[PDB]
From a paper:
SET domain methyltransferases deposit methyl marks on specific histone tail lysine residues and play a major role in epigenetic regulation of gene transcription. Methylation of H3K9 in humans relies mostly on members of the Suv39 family, namely EHMT1/GLP, EHMT2/G9a, SUV39H1, SUV39H2, SETDB1 and SETDB2, as well as then non-Suv39 enzymes PRDM2 and ASH1L.
The specificity of PRDM2 is unknown. Unlike I-SET, Post-SET is absent from the PRDM2 structure, which lacks co-crystallized SAM or SAH. The Post-SET domains of G9a, GLP, SUV39H2, but not PRDM2 include a ZnCys motif previously observed in the structures of Dim-5 and the H3K4 methyltransferase MLL1. (1) A flexible or even disordered state when no co-factor or peptide is bound. Mapping the electrostatic potential along the molecular surface of GLP, G9a, SUV39H2 and PRDM2 shows that the peptide-binding groove is consistently electronegative.
Residue numbers in the entry: 1 to 147
Amino acid sequence: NQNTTEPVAATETLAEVPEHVLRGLPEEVRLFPSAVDKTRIGVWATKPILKGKKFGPFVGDKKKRSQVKNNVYMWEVYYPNLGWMCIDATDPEKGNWLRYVNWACSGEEQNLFPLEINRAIYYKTLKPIAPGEELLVWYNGEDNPEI
């Protein structure tokens, strides 16, 4: 979280992405080091993307909250008669290219928001995205005007 002189303990490069994850991207996006955290891989637009474009589904292993160790590579989704489950893509072999979409910092420059369809998370564009801009997800906000 810092451009400083302290040593970095772990780096993720393009060489470490699973081959089947790379083969799965649509034309509009590519994988490339994140500008938000250059020690990890992120997702970038290759061409103009319209507002309202949907990507997904996000996939991952179903686990109880008590078994998941981070809030970065996971979403929570309810399954009737099974309960609230975490969909965990911490291990990239269990997920797809949506795993690599980094999070906006306090929503800054967010251009993707989550929506649930058929008990899976998809990402939808909040605004148009220009070629060479990083895809960044954050939560839904309360958008209504108090005027």
